[PDB]
Design an enzyme around this catalytic site. Sequence first.
Site, PDB file in Angstrom:
ATOM      1  N   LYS A  22      54.457  24.804  77.267  1.00 17.15           N
ATOM      2  CA  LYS A  22      53.866  25.995  76.686  1.00 17.15           C
ATOM      3  C   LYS A  22      53.009  25.581  75.489  1.00 17.15           C
ATOM      4  O   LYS A  22      51.849  26.009  75.341  1.00 17.15           O
ATOM      5  CB  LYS A  22      54.974  26.921  76.152  1.00 17.15           C
ATOM      6  CG  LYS A  22      54.488  28.019  75.180  1.00 17.15           C
ATOM      7  CD  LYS A  22      55.677  28.589  74.383  1.00 17.15           C
ATOM      8  CE  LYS A  22      55.279  29.747  73.459  1.00 17.15           C
ATOM      9  NZ  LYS A  22      54.174  29.405  72.453  1.00 17.15           N
ATOM     10  N   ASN A  23      53.596  24.747  74.625  1.00 12.58           N
ATOM     11  CA  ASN A  23      52.913  24.349  73.406  1.00 12.58           C
ATOM     12  C   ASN A  23      51.903  23.217  73.441  1.00 12.58           C
ATOM     13  O   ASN A  23      51.370  22.826  72.393  1.00 12.58           O
ATOM     14  CB  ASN A  23      53.941  24.183  72.267  1.00 12.58           C
ATOM     15  CG  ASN A  23      54.557  25.509  71.876  1.00 12.58           C
ATOM     16  OD1 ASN A  23      53.952  26.558  72.112  1.00 12.58           O
ATOM     17  ND2 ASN A  23      55.756  25.486  71.273  1.00 12.58           N
ATOM     18  N   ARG A  91      51.148  33.280  68.520  1.00 10.18           N
ATOM     19  CA  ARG A  91      50.735  32.398  67.428  1.00 10.18           C
ATOM     20  C   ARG A  91      49.460  31.574  67.742  1.00 10.18           C
ATOM     21  O   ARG A  91      48.601  31.370  66.873  1.00 10.18           O
ATOM     22  CB  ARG A  91      51.886  31.435  67.109  1.00 10.18           C
ATOM     23  CG  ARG A  91      51.573  30.410  66.023  1.00 10.18           C
ATOM     24  CD  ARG A  91      51.550  31.066  64.640  1.00 10.18           C
ATOM     25  NE  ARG A  91      51.408  30.091  63.536  1.00 10.18           N
ATOM     26  CZ  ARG A  91      51.209  30.443  62.261  1.00 10.18           C
ATOM     27  NH1 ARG A  91      51.129  31.725  61.933  1.00 10.18           N
ATOM     28  NH2 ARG A  91      51.096  29.518  61.307  1.00 10.18           N
ATOM     29  N   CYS A 115      56.380  34.294  67.424  1.00  8.77           N
ATOM     30  CA  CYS A 115      57.784  34.374  67.003  1.00  8.77           C
ATOM     31  C   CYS A 115      57.985  34.923  65.610  1.00  8.77           C
ATOM     32  O   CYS A 115      57.495  34.337  64.647  1.00  8.77           O
ATOM     33  CB  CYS A 115      58.468  33.008  67.161  1.00  8.77           C
ATOM     34  SG  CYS A 115      58.538  32.478  68.888  1.00  8.77           S
ATOM     35  N   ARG A 120      55.265  32.721  58.281  1.00  9.47           N
ATOM     36  CA  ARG A 120      54.252  31.963  59.018  1.00  9.47           C
ATOM     37  C   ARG A 120      52.791  32.125  58.571  1.00  9.47           C
ATOM     38  O   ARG A 120      51.949  32.657  59.309  1.00  9.47           O
ATOM     39  CB  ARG A 120      54.334  32.270  60.526  1.00  9.47           C
ATOM     40  CG  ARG A 120      55.730  32.107  61.084  1.00  9.47           C
ATOM     41  CD  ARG A 120      55.748  32.253  62.604  1.00  9.47           C
ATOM     42  NE  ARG A 120      55.259  31.049  63.273  1.00  9.47           N
ATOM     43  CZ  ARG A 120      55.211  30.923  64.593  1.00  9.47           C
ATOM     44  NH1 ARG A 120      55.623  31.927  65.369  1.00  9.47           N
ATOM     45  NH2 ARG A 120      54.740  29.802  65.142  1.00  9.47           N
ATOM     46  N   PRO A 121      52.471  31.659  57.362  1.00 12.64           N
ATOM     47  CA  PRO A 121      51.091  31.767  56.875  1.00 12.64           C
ATOM     48  C   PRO A 121      50.200  30.745  57.631  1.00 12.64           C
ATOM     49  O   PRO A 121      50.699  29.936  58.433  1.00 12.64           O
ATOM     50  CB  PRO A 121      51.227  31.435  55.387  1.00 12.64           C
ATOM     51  CG  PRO A 121      52.369  30.451  55.362  1.00 12.64           C
ATOM     52  CD  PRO A 121      53.362  31.096  56.330  1.00 12.64           C
ATOM     53  N   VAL A 161      53.904  19.289  56.454  1.00 12.55           N
ATOM     54  CA  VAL A 161      53.755  18.967  57.867  1.00 12.55           C
ATOM     55  C   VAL A 161      53.550  20.255  58.667  1.00 12.55           C
ATOM     56  O   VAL A 161      54.369  21.191  58.593  1.00 12.55           O
ATOM     57  CB  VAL A 161      55.003  18.223  58.402  1.00 12.55           C
ATOM     58  CG1 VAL A 161      54.838  17.921  59.892  1.00 12.55           C
ATOM     59  CG2 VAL A 161      55.189  16.905  57.614  1.00 12.55           C
ATOM     60  N   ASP A 305      62.673  24.265  67.700  1.00  6.68           N
ATOM     61  CA  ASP A 305      62.634  25.066  68.941  1.00  6.68           C
ATOM     62  C   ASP A 305      63.890  24.890  69.832  1.00  6.68           C
ATOM     63  O   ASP A 305      64.037  25.586  70.846  1.00  6.68           O
ATOM     64  CB  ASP A 305      61.357  24.796  69.745  1.00  6.68           C
ATOM     65  CG  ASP A 305      60.159  25.604  69.225  1.00  6.68           C
ATOM     66  OD1 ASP A 305      60.351  26.482  68.359  1.00  6.68           O
ATOM     67  OD2 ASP A 305      59.020  25.368  69.689  1.00  6.68           O
ATOM     68  N   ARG A 397      57.171  34.638  77.424  1.00  7.56           N
ATOM     69  CA  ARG A 397      56.159  33.954  76.616  1.00  7.56           C
ATOM     70  C   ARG A 397      56.316  32.453  76.721  1.00  7.56           C
ATOM     71  O   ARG A 397      55.335  31.719  76.562  1.00  7.56           O
ATOM     72  CB  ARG A 397      56.311  34.297  75.123  1.00  7.56           C
ATOM     73  CG  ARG A 397      56.064  35.762  74.690  1.00  7.56           C
ATOM     74  CD  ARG A 397      56.079  35.838  73.133  1.00  7.56           C
ATOM     75  NE  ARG A 397      55.059  34.943  72.574  1.00  7.56           N
ATOM     76  CZ  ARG A 397      55.155  34.285  71.424  1.00  7.56           C
ATOM     77  NH1 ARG A 397      56.232  34.407  70.652  1.00  7.56           N
ATOM     78  NH2 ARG A 397      54.176  33.454  71.064  1.00  7.56           N
TER      79      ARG A 397
HETATM   80  C1  LIG Z   1      52.216  27.754  69.616  1.00  5.64           C
HETATM   81  C2  LIG Z   1      53.020  26.546  69.090  1.00  5.64           C
HETATM   82  O1  LIG Z   1      52.705  25.392  69.241  1.00  5.64           O
HETATM   83  N1  LIG Z   1      54.144  26.860  68.414  1.00  5.64           N
HETATM   84  C3  LIG Z   1      55.047  25.865  67.807  1.00  5.64           C
HETATM   85  C4  LIG Z   1      54.440  25.363  66.487  1.00  5.64           C
HETATM   86  O2  LIG Z   1      54.165  26.497  65.632  1.00  5.64           O
HETATM   87  P1  LIG Z   1      53.415  26.315  64.256  1.00  5.64           P
HETATM   88  O3  LIG Z   1      52.239  25.587  64.620  1.00  5.64           O
HETATM   89  O4  LIG Z   1      53.173  27.604  63.655  1.00  5.64           O
HETATM   90  O5  LIG Z   1      54.318  25.381  63.363  1.00  5.64           O
HETATM   91  P2  LIG Z   1      54.007  24.805  62.002  1.00  5.64           P
HETATM   92  O6  LIG Z   1      54.379  23.415  62.200  1.00  5.64           O
HETATM   93  O7  LIG Z   1      52.602  24.927  61.613  1.00  5.64           O
HETATM   94  O8  LIG Z   1      54.922  25.376  60.898  1.00  5.64           O
HETATM   95  C5  LIG Z   1      55.903  24.557  60.219  1.00  5.64           C
HETATM   96  C6  LIG Z   1      56.248  25.106  58.812  1.00  5.64           C
HETATM   97  O9  LIG Z   1      55.009  25.121  58.100  1.00  5.64           O
HETATM   98  C7  LIG Z   1      54.740  26.438  57.635  1.00  5.64           C
HETATM   99  N2  LIG Z   1      53.236  26.587  57.623  1.00  5.64           N
HETATM  100  C8  LIG Z   1      52.491  26.376  58.783  1.00  5.64           C
HETATM  101  C9  LIG Z   1      51.125  26.522  58.774  1.00  5.64           C
HETATM  102  C10 LIG Z   1      50.430  26.905  57.561  1.00  5.64           C
HETATM  103  O10 LIG Z   1      49.216  27.045  57.497  1.00  5.64           O
HETATM  104  N3  LIG Z   1      51.233  27.099  56.477  1.00  5.64           N
HETATM  105  C11 LIG Z   1      52.579  26.959  56.456  1.00  5.64           C
HETATM  106  O11 LIG Z   1      53.221  27.171  55.386  1.00  5.64           O
HETATM  107  C12 LIG Z   1      55.488  27.346  58.572  1.00  5.64           C
HETATM  108  O12 LIG Z   1      55.424  28.817  58.302  1.00  5.64           O
HETATM  109  C13 LIG Z   1      56.818  26.574  58.766  1.00  5.64           C
HETATM  110  O13 LIG Z   1      57.681  26.972  57.622  1.00  5.64           O
HETATM  111  O14 LIG Z   1      55.346  24.422  65.886  1.00  5.64           O
HETATM  112  C14 LIG Z   1      56.665  24.997  65.542  1.00  5.64           C
HETATM  113  C15 LIG Z   1      57.520  23.943  64.818  1.00  5.64           C
HETATM  114  O15 LIG Z   1      57.812  22.735  65.629  1.00  5.64           O
HETATM  115  C16 LIG Z   1      57.312  25.492  66.856  1.00  5.64           C
HETATM  116  O16 LIG Z   1      58.641  25.961  66.423  1.00  5.64           O
HETATM  117  C17 LIG Z   1      56.382  26.538  67.527  1.00  5.64           C
HETATM  118  O17 LIG Z   1      56.975  26.969  68.808  1.00  5.64           O
HETATM  119  C1  LIG Z   2      58.125  30.766  69.079  1.00  8.20           C
HETATM  120  C2  LIG Z   2      58.237  30.054  67.678  1.00  8.20           C
HETATM  121  C3  LIG Z   2      56.792  30.433  69.819  1.00  8.20           C
HETATM  122  O1  LIG Z   2      56.732  29.118  70.348  1.00  8.20           O
HETATM  123  P1  LIG Z   2      55.218  30.687  68.928  1.00  8.20           P
HETATM  124  O2  LIG Z   2      54.221  30.638  69.928  1.00  8.20           O
HETATM  125  O3  LIG Z   2      55.149  31.959  68.282  1.00  8.20           O
HETATM  126  O4  LIG Z   2      55.049  29.628  67.967  1.00  8.20           O
END
Ligand SMILES: CC(=O)N[C@H]1[C@@H](OP(=O)(O)OP(=O)(O)OC[C@H]2O[C@@H](n3ccc(=O)[nH]c3=O)[C@H](O)[C@@H]2O)O[C@H](CO)[C@@H](O)[C@@H]1O
Ligand SMILES: *[C@H](C)[C@H](O)P(=O)(O)O
Length: 419
Positions: A22-23, A91, A115, A120-121, A161, A305, A397
């Site tokens: 999915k990701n 997302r 999710c 999630r900013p 990260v 996840d 999803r």
């Molecule tokens: C569509 C997809 O690929 N989703 C995955 C992706 O989401 P996602 O890409 O949103 O995961 P992130 O790694 O970016 O987020 C990790 C941490 O960083 C924070 N953060 C992120 C971005 C930003 O601009 N600012 C910030 O503060 C988050 O809110 C969280 O506390 O990785 C997550 C962590 O392995 C998975 O659980 C999600 O299923």
């Molecule tokens: C649950 C965290 C899902 O993988 P996302 O697509 O919303 O990141």
Amino acid sequence: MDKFRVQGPTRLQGEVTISGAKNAALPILFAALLAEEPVEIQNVPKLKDIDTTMKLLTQLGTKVERXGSVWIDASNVNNFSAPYDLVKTMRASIWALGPLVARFGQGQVSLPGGCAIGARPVDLHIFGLEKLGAEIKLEEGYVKASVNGRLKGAHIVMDKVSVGATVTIMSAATLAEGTTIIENAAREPEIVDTANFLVALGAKISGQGTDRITIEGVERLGGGVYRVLPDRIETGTFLVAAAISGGKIVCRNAQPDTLDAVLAKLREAGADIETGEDWISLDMHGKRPKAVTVRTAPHPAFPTDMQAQFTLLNLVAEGTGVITETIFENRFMHVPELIRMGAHAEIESNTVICHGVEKLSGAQVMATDLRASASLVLAGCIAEGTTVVDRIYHIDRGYERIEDKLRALGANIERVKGE
Ligand SMILES: CC(=O)N[C@H]1[C@@H](OP(=O)(O)OP(=O)(O)OC[C@H]2O[C@@H](n3ccc(=O)[nH]c3=O)[C@H](O)[C@@H]2O)O[C@H](CO)[C@@H](O)[C@@H]1O
Ligand SMILES: *[C@H](C)[C@H](O)P(=O)(O)O
């Protein structure tokens, strides 16, 4: 709203063929916005997020078609504003921004959905695009990116990260002028897969899978064929399904090296695991799992996840276990629902103290996100009696055909329309 009615207890055993990630499919589909020539992306799972993505791309002027593969022709993309209604349902929509500004000089996307497990900013995505020379402004509910001419390569140091921001920056960088170096880059297998897809289109990227990614921008990306890697979270979910039910399951079309931490944790829990080039088997030998300590962290550490699923494992395990969530701030709502099914646990800040019980009891339960919802369905499979999991569209999803797969493993499951 559809629900899954599950009658337990049932041992889950047999085999399952893992679908594409999915990701990895999602960031690759958005990366295809950079492609000037036809693209064929293979092994794409049939998920609601993929359907939303195809509709979103189409609205930007992309021509999309699908079966097992998805065909993308982004040659005529001509609308650079993503619609709020599609953007807010997942997302992955945030990934439309970087490709649009990198290739067309402009892009507009609303804040994403997905999710509901934290605030999630997207500040890190904003940070990275600005470092590449884009102007970012928040107006009319949109994150607007623009640049006059090409983006410019930069030495970008990530303060935190982020899987998503790493993808946004790496993707946009492929068409920037010069070299971009992302420090403290996310190492997830999906980032490697997205990088290699970009390279198949003509990008120059090295270091994917490590904390430092180097991108040498090119004038344009062409087309090509690329197969999406196996879904490690769907894989982990079925391995946990065997582990909590005393069964043996063999997962096919798997990629063992994406699960070092999950496999190690299952071995601590008592699992007998074997792996081959593209498969993973887990035999619990009918035994109850042993409680374990889990701490989520960025890849290659234990994945957030798989957190809800391992919480379920500890709640039916022998002994006291621990689940510490360091990535998201609101990812424990599956806990009070499992407690209503008979589990014993205490939440202490970002940790759940688990006290395993021998058997869960069926109940009417509900989760407001993908992995927690799938975890409640697994709990229903092993609980005594009837469990009704409401709002299972969340599972759609992220899992292709979870109903048929669980039934083939022995589950007594039915999808009902409900009231
Ligand atoms: C569509 C997809 O690929 N989703 C995955 C992706 O989401 P996602 O890409 O949103 O995961 P992130 O790694 O970016 O987020 C990790 C941490 O960083 C924070 N953060 C992120 C971005 C930003 O601009 N600012 C910030 O503060 C988050 O809110 C969280 O506390 O990785 C997550 C962590 O392995 C998975 O659980 C999600 O299923
Ligand atoms: C649950 C965290 C899902 O993988 P996302 O697509 O919303 O990141």
